[PDB]
Design a protein around this nucleic acid. Sequence first.
RNA 1: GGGAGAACAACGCG
RNA 2: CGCGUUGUUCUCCC
Lengths: 120, 120
Amino acid sequence: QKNLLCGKCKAYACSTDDIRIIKDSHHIVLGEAFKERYTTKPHKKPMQFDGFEKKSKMYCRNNNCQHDWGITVKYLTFDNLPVIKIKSFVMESQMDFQKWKSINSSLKNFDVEEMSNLYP
Amino acid sequence: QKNLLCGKCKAYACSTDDIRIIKDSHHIVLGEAFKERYTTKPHKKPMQFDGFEKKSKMYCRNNNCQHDWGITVKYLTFDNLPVIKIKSFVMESQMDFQKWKSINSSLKNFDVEEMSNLYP
RNA sequence: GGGAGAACAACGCG
RNA sequence: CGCGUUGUUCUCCC
Ligand SMILES: [Zn+2]
Ligand SMILES: [Zn+2]
């Protein structure tokens, strides 16, 4: 429905249709397209929490921006799963993503069977 | 009733009985005793608002502390009236003044006629 | 990654 | 002085 942009450099991030919610907190982003739009550097200090094990940090790929976008994690069998930081993004036109969520219907809950279809 | 202490150095500030509220926001402190417990240096940037004209900044007199306590102002005919910064103080016992206010009854509203009695 | 907490430095309105 | 906002640091829980 609505598009997210890098809060810092406003480059296209992803669509709300491509987001899923795991355990009513974490925002992950489906599709291999998205992965072209960020780069990753390894985590200084390891943390596992919830289902997740942390793998790396996400940064806007725009070299002049490198805004902190979130982390990648392994959840269940799904590795290199990008989880985005909701304060790091804004919406196309203006308002930020936090605000947007508050006034819109819930995003889709992550569905493992759907996920097993996209990443067999 | 309850005593306020310099948040930084814990030196005795004033009693809650010596505080008055002007326009449901500003906390001023009666009595010439109090004035011995802070020092002032003129205000770096003069601003009038509400009734007040700013005169100076307040600092804890303890030379090793000099915590920012608030400002002095002229209101109506009353010059060099100390207004304290509620985040700068804590309560004897520990909790801070902000917290204390939230769980206690309202402090006394400033009364100009009372004030005309103390400072004729 | 989400939820809180405290500190510092500043920006805006009165 | 109140109010609202930012950046950063430290920490807790998950
Ligand atoms: Zn960017
Ligand atoms: Zn002090």
